[PDB]
Enzyme design. Structure first.
Site: not given
Ligand SMILES: Nc1nc2c(ncn2[C@@H]2O[C@H](COP(=O)(O)OP(=O)(O)OP(=O)(O)O)[C@@H](O)[C@H]2O)c(=O)[nH]1
Ligand SMILES: [Mg+2]
Ligand SMILES: Nc1nc2c(ncn2[C@@H]2O[C@H](COP(=O)(O)OP(=O)(O)O)[C@@H](O)[C@H]2O)c(=O)[nH]1
Lengths: 430, 103, 430, 140
Positions: C11, C62, C131, C135-136, C170, C197, C219, C245
């Site tokens: 995500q 997802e 991120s 998980g994913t 989070t 963040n 972002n 480089e």
């Molecule tokens: N900088 C930034 N960090 C994000 C954003 N959205 C989620 N995160 C970070 O991503 C972490 C969790 O992973 P996510 O990207 O939200 O979810 P995921 O990587 O798809 O993993 P799943 O939960 O299995 O779906 C959180 O602790 C957030 O700090 C974003 O829009 N910008």
């Molecule tokens: Mg997700």
């Protein structure tokens, strides 16, 4: 995709569902005739989560209604939004259980459950990708607490990898409406811990306390308690039906709120809640939501959360708001209350944001926290159980239908072991 | 600037007991889904779906800045008005002294 | 004849990919429909007549975010079948996205990667965004990196990972999968950039003067950093720098490739034009510890090598006159075995502004990529957080039951201990 | 660290010890001059220059920066000398509570002497092992 089916049993569960489905239909703009009349495009994108599609363009809930007596389902059909339910899903017996757990779990509930399991299997095999099941039932009744819990085991035996939810109303000793409540509460808690992936306890006493103190309405009725429970129920799966900054399905909450597989008994609460006369005074801000969210009187259980320490916590914010404020407020609510948070697991609060608020409200929060303070409910239930069992009072009713006292002893021992090992981690230190 | 009119305008005071006279003269709840239109909480159903804090915040932020700007111009003008009167009065004093001398 | 492919998984990865892909389309004059109303070739490909197709692939299990992408204004831009989507989310479980559901999706992604690579003739390398605390994201990033490292070999891969903040979090279980993913990409990625963040929140609050930021504001800054890094490949410049480089200039040893970034200037249009924004003051602001893009203090450690990019009308002599001033200061000290540590790049194209955004239009900007010894603190604090819960084996059952072995947690701990020892061994003077 | 109050003789010994050290700034009030942790970092750096990176400790008037300096010194330096200052004692020092810094200086002096002796023994033992290995390789 990733949809769930609804199964309810007993009179209390049927009355909870009769308002839960009304709330869902009002949220998605579905008329009581099954015709969509909504305003926004997002109202239809993820309608497959709870509703099926039939010819003629109308929608039908994938709910299964079961009881051992026909009166409650014959009454819920005449209520508003009662026509949505498919007549085929109504299954009932002709005898009833009479608040006797043995009758609803060994003699009568065993023969009837095949028909309801047939329709349950029909519903689950068909759906696109199963997410899981959610169960509403009461632990204070015989037929409910028996047939529902046996159905839990039967479903778990066939779908071991899916997720299972249970919203369980436990009998409080303050407002008691049945004398044999401790027996079927203790017997049900024994089976419920072994199979349910998540459990959420709800107490009528806490609902009356909330209605009398926060909303300050003069005459509470079961419709208000059902409405609060329905709002809390809807708040959990909101981000699974709507877009948001951080989507979080039920399985993600299961991962983050259950440290050990046997500690899955949560207590919940909904914010905001304000009286009619003070709804204009208040201003909806994230600090105002979070201060009411962690308020002790706002919990849906009589358990006092400052009598123990939170193992973990979760919050599901609704509406459009800045994430920086949410994170800083979550940090602040955890720095100012370090004494009530267990110290060997840092950063034990989970947050999520959904951009679609409830109809009529601009911001809303659903709180799900796993705390050690829940031990007090099992303590008092077991206290009443052992006060009544030592004289073998009302035991002949249960023992006349093939049950024995050994299953009572094992249930009491397992419940006490659960009570002990749940508080074992309260005194644990790093 | 404390100020009063002429003696004639007040016209109540030559041994008045009117003030004494005046004292004698006195001798299933559904409020969650139904917050009041007045309240802050009520978001219209039609607008329930704007999902962007970004755009909304930018417009809101712009408005919040603008009020402050007009306020600043107004308060400064009030400051200017006390000072202008004092400058004027000193100049006036000189003119007046001059006027009496000429009389 | 120079190309680069960007991979977006999770995500956070998709939400930052959207942010960078408005910026690139705006910078090259391409409308959101993909139609222009020879520098595009680095990120895009010509279809023969009309539209351009990005050299990017979006991954997620997802479906909500991808569905949001496929209905927005950019529905016509991306190729319909490179937005690979799953059905079931990993739900913050690392073992799920590495052993259970990611394996069935990874083959399609690898097929798409091959189909995109056969089109390129001068492939510089890969970019990946994920991120880490999910998980994913972490699991699929690890699996994709491991597959690519053997399918292609010596091609360079760059990772813009977002580690969790020191105290703000989070989830509650993100240290586990963060440590495991660091284990996975330690021996598999050529460059890793820190992006937590909290530091960017502080940057927005202090400079942009926004008190309620959302993820989009973060972002956009990340997208600007990416554009500044890759500007030298698609615009004429007096002192060019290529992706290949880097390991010859910023990576002293194969193990040490984690570095933290900074950007300057960051200022709003309301007060930008009142000051001259000379090169000296912007290059001073870029080295300020409070303007680090990751919440780490550079005053706590030595510098190893600094690679810093300029763009606009900057003249090299002014750059040298400012590097001398920084070498003069007593609060910034370099490692003993590195007499010169600066690599300088100069480009002519000024940074582009996105309408409705935060940043204003300026003629000079600086982006620095600096490798420093102080980065070990984030590893130490993540390790401390991990140990607290791994002492009691909390939340482990959610990972053992998804096919992962018990001992897999220990070796990641050993590799982190090895990395921390290596960082201490390098920083001592001879 | 509940150390007893220092007597006048022990205080004079600590002050004479600190005056024997060429510090970057002249001392006027030890309680205030040490409250930022920078002077304690210099004192330790004089005897153990490889143990303390003095540039990590900026001169400080703010409670937040004093607390950062003290926590950094306590974790990175004092812990390696086999002692740590309590949070309450750090809070007393940053507020320039009388006797708070003098107690810490006394503990630091004793721990520094012990640390230097243990470093000398390790060098002498390592030199003995290196010399013994050179005598075996000469016979090979
Ligand atoms: N900088 C930034 N960090 C994000 C954003 N959205 C989620 N995160 C970070 O991503 C972490 C969790 O992973 P996510 O990207 O939200 O979810 P995921 O990587 O798809 O993993 P799943 O939960 O299995 O779906 C959180 O602790 C957030 O700090 C974003 O829009 N910008
Ligand atoms: Mg997700
Ligand atoms: N919230 C709510 N609780 C109810 C309602 N009706 C009954 N209950 C609770 O359910 C308990 C009795 O359960 P019971 O009807 O015997 O369950 P059954 O045996 O499965 O039919 C009482 O203690 C009530 O507190 C209702 O309409 N709403």
């Amino acid at each position: 995709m990733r949809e769930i089916v609804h199964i309810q049993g007993g009179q209390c569960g049927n009355q909870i569902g009769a308002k839960f489905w009304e709330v869902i239909s009002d949220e998605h703009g579905i008329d009581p005739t099954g015709t969509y009349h909504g305003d926004s495009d997002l109202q239809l994108e993820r309608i497959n989560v709870y509703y099926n599609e039939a010819t003629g363009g109308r929608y039908v809930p994938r709910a299964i209604l079961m009881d051992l007596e026909p009166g409650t389902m014959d009454s819920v059909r005449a209520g508003p939004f009662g026509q949505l339910f498919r007549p085929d899903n109504f299954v009932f017996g002709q005898t009833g259980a009479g608040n006797n757990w043995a009758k609803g779990h060994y003699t009568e509930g065993a023969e009837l459950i095949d028909s309801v399991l047939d329709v349950v299997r029909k519903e689950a095999e068909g759906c696109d990708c199963l997410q899981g099941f959610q169960i509403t039932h009461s632990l204070g009744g015989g037929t409910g607490s028996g047939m529902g819990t046996l159905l839990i085991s039967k479903v778990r035996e066939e779908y071991p990898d899916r997720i299972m939810e249970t919203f369980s109303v436990v009998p409080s000793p303050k407002v008691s409406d049945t004398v044999v409540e401790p027996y079927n509460a203790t017997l049900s808690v024994h089976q419920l811990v072994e199979n349910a992936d998540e459990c959420m306890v709800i107490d009528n006493e806490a609902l009356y306390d909330i209605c009398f103190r926060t909303l300050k309405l003069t005459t509470p009725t079961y419709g208000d308690l059902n409405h609060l429970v329905s709002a809390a129920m809807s708040g959990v799966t909101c981000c699974l039906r709507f877009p948001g900054q951080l989507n979080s399905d039920l399985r993600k909450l299961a991962v983050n709120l259950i440290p050990f597989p046997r500690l899955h008994f949560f207590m919940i609460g909904f914010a905001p809640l304000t009286s009619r006369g003070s709804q204009q005074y208040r201003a909806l801000t994230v600090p105002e939501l979070t201060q009411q969210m962690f308020d002790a009187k706002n919990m849906m259980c009589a358990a006092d959360p400052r009598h123990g320490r939170y193992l973990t916590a979760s919050a599901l914010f609704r509406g459009r708001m800045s994430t920086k404020e949410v994170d800083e407020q979550m940090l602040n609510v955890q720095n100012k209350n370090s004494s009530y948070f267990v110290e060997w697991i840092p950063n034990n609060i989970k947050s999520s944001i959904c951009d679609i608020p409830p109809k009529g409200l601009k911001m809303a929060v659903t709180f799900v926290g796993n705390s050690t303070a829940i031990q007090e409910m099992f303590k008092r239930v077991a206290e009443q159980f052992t006060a009544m069992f030592r004289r073998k009072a009302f035991l002949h009713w249960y023992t006349g239908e093939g049950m024995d006292e050994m299953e009572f002893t094992e249930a009491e021992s397992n419940m006490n072991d659960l009570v002990s090992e749940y508080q074992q981690y309260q005194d644990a230190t790093a | 600037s404390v100020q009063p009119r002429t003696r004639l305008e007040r016209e109540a005071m030559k041994d008045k007991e009117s003030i004494e006279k005046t004292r004698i003269n006195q001798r299933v709840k559904q409020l969650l889904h139904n917050p009041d239109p007045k309240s802050t909480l009520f978001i219209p159903e039609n607008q329930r779906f704007d999902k962007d804090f970004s755009v909304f915040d930018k417009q809101q932020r712009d408005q919040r800045f603008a009020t402050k700007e007009v306020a600043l111009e107004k308060h400064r003008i009030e400051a200017l008005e006390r000072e202008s009167k004092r400058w004027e009065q000193m100049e006036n004093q000189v003119n007046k002294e001059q006027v009496k001398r000429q009389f | 004849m120079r190309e680069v492919i960007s991979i977006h998984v999770g995500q956070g990865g998709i939400q930052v990919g959207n942010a960078c892909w408005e910026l690139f389309c705006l910078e090259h004059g391409i409308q959101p429909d993909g139609q222009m109303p020879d520098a595009f070739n680095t990120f895009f490909s010509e279809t023969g007549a009309g539209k351009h197709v990005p050299r990017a692939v979006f991954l997620d299990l997802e479906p909500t975010v991808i569905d949001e992408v496929r209905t927005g204004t950019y529905r016509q831009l991306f190729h319909p079948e490179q937005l690979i989507s799953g059905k079931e989310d990993a739900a913050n479980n690392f073992a799920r996205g590495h052993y259970t559901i990611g394996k069935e999706i990874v083959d399609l992604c690898l097929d798409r990667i091959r189909k995109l690579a056969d089109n390129c003739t001068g492939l510089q390398g890969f970019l990946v965004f994920n991120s880490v605390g999910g998980g994913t994201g972490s699991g699929l990033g690890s699996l994709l990196l491991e597959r690519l490292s053997v399918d292609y070999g010596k091609k360079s891969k760059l990772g813009f990972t977002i580690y969790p903040s020191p105290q703000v979090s989070t989830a509650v279980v993100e240290p586990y999968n963060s440590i495991l993913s660091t284990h996975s990409l330690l021996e598999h990625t050529d460059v890793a950039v820190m992006l937590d963040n909290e530091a960017i929140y502080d940057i927005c609050r202090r400079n942009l003067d926004i008190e309620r930021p959302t993820y989009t504001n973060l972002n956009r800054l990340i997208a600007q950093v990416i554009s500044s890094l890759t500007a030298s490949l698609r615009f004429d410049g007096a002192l060019n720098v290529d992706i290949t480089e880097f390991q010859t200039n910023l990576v002293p040893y194969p193990r040490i490739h984690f570095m933290l970034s900074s950007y300057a200037p960051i200022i709003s249009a309301e007060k930008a034009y009142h000051e001259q924004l000379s090169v000296a003051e912007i290059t001073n602001s870029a080295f300020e510890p409070a303007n680090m893009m990751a919440k780490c203090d550079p005053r706590h450690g030595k510098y190893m090598a600094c690679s810093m990019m300029y763009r606009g009308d900057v003249v090299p002599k002014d750059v040298n006159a400012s590097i001398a001033t920084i070498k003069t200061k007593r609060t910034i000290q370099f490692v003993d075995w590195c007499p010169t540590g600066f690599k300088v790049g100069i480009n002519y194209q000024p940074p582009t502004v996105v309408p409705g955004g935060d940043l204003a239009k300026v003629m000079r900007a600086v982006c620095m990529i600096s490798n420093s010894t102080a980065i070990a603190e984030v590893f130490s604090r993540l390790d401390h957080k991990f140990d607290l819960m791994y002492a009691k084996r909390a939340f482990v059952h959610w990972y053992v039951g998804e096919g992962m072995e018990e001992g897999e947690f220990s070796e990641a701990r050993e590799d982190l201990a090895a990395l921390e020892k290596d960082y201490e061994e390098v920083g001592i003077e001879t | 660290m509940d150390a007893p109050p220092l007597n006048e003789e022990e205080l004079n010994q600590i002050y004479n010890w600190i005056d024997g050290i060429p510090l970057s700034r002249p001392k006027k009030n030890i309680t205030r001059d040490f409250a930022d942790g920078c002077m304690l970092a210099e004192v330790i750096s004089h005897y153990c220059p490889k143990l303390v990176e003095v540039h990590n400790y900026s001169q400080a008037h703010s409670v937040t920066q004093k607390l950062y300096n003290w926590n950094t010194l306590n974790q990175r330096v004092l812990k390696k000398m086999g002692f740590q200052i309590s949070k309450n004692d750090i809070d007393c020092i940053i507020n320039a509570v009388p006797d708070a810094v003098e107690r810490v200086l006394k503990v630091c002096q004793i721990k520094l002497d012990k640390y230097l002796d243990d470093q000398k023994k390790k060098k002498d033992q390592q030199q003995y092992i290196e010399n013994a290995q050179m005598m075996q390789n000469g016979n090979k």
